[PDB]
Amino acid sequence: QANTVYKLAQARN
Amino acid sequence: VVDRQTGAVVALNDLSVGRYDVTVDVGPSYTARRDATVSVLTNVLSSMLPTDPMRPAIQGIILDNIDGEGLDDFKEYNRNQLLISGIAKPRNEKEQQIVQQAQMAAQSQPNPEMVLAQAQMVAAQAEAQKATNETAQTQIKAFTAQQDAMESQANTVYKLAQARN
Amino acid sequence: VVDRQTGAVVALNDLSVGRYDVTVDVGPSYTARRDATVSVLTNVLSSMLPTDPMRPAIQGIILDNIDGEGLDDFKEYNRNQLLISGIAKPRNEKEQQIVQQAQMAAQSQPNPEMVLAQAQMVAAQAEAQKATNETAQTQIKAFTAQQDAMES
């Protein structure tokens, strides 16, 4: 869950 | 109250005691108390059905009072078997602390053996009881999977939002 | 109502009591009350089948009342057995809290032993509780799976 939240933040670029 | 005594330098008779609670009667003439005990116990026996439960106790008490030559070992064996059955009430010399300890320990020690003689259900009950605490791991896994499902719902909702670019 | 007793410094005869409720009859002559009790119990015996349930209790009652020399241990054992079966009615000096206490303790103790003697069903019945957690897991999955389909 934490890693996927980080990935969501990252996909914003 | 469980004993009798009388004592005096010269026998003292207290006139305030009064009449006793004993009744005079006639009966058979016996040379020794053992003969009287044997006769009364034999009269008690032979009037009961052979399948009665107290017949072995009566027989043991009868053979315990028999007096004869060269019967010491048999009398000792019979007395030991009478102590094992909890009937003889040791006269507080050596068998109240050694034989009593021995038989209580010998009744406590084979307790696992006699429970194991039919305790085959113990394995099943232990398995079921610990399953009663483990198998809830299925519910825990379901809860974790539900949390992962909502997390993936949020993940893919964000993915749909970002996919519009 | 359970006790016969009268008290008087010099015997009081209450003239208002009236005639008693007893009848004068005749019977066998006995030297002591133990003889009468033993005779009555023996006459009661020999008149029922050997397989009747009350015969051991009557035998215990008879052997309680018999007297002799050197019978202390046997009488103690017989009285103990009679007390254990709830017939002797301990006379509230020490047995009601020693031997009766031992009997109630040894009645409470082996209930698990006796249920264990035939309780192979207990594991299966305990399992029924576990399936309440285990089987519903498929239903819990059924609702959660519905989301994993509408979301997709």
DSSP H helices, chain C, are 33-44, 55-65, 72-84, 95-108, 111-116, 120-150
C-alpha C21/C-alpha C15 separation (Å) is: 15
Q: How many CB atoms lie within 10 A of CB C18?
A: 7
Task: Please choose, from the candidates C66, C76, C87, the residue with its C-alpha nearest in 3D space to the C-alpha of residue B47.
Answer: C66
- CB within 8 A of C61, min separation 6: which ones? C41, C82, C87
Answer positive or negative: Cα dihedral of C95, C97, C102, C106: positive
Task: DSSP for C81-102, please give it.
Answer: HHHHTT-S---SSSHHHHHHHH
Q: Name residues whose C-beta falls within 8 Å of residue A5's C-beta, 6 or more positions apart in sequence.
A: none
Which residue bears the tokens 């006459």?
C43
- For B105-155, the three-class secondary structure string (H helix, E strand, C coil) is HHHHCCHHHHHHCCCCHHHHHHHHHHHHHHCCHHHHHHHHHHHHHHHHHHH
Task: Please report the number of interchain residue pairs, chain A to chain B, with beta-carbon separation below 8 angstroms.
Answer: 14
Solved by what technique? cryo-EM
Q: Which residue in the block uniquely carries the two structure tokens 């109502």?
A: C1
CA distance B79 to A3: 83
B-C Cβ pairs (cutoff 8 Å, strict): 103
Longest dimension (CA), chain A: 20
Residues of B in contact with A12 (CB under 8 A): 162
Pair of tokens at residue C22: 């007893």
Q: Torsions phi, psi of C79, nearest 5?
A: -65, -35
Residue C32 DSSP code: S
Exposed, middle or buried: residue C74 (CB in 10 Å: 0-12, 13-18, 19+)?
Answer: buried
Burial class (CB in 10 A: 0-12, 13-18, 19+), C70: middle
CB contact under 8 A, C137 and B138: yes
Do the chains contact at B155 and A4, CB–CB below 8 Å? yes
Q: Which helix (H) or strand (E) holds B100?
A: helix B99-108
d(CA C104, CA C97): 10
B and A in touch (3+ CB pairs within 8 angstroms): yes
The CB-based long-range contact list for B100-103 (8 Å cut-off, 24+ gap) reads none
Gap between the Cα atoms of C51 and B81, Å rounded:
29
Residue of B nearest to C146 (CA): B149
Tell me how far apart the alpha carbons of residues B73 and B154 are, in angstroms, rounded to a whole number: 92
Whether A11 sits inside 8 A of B147 (CB atoms) is no
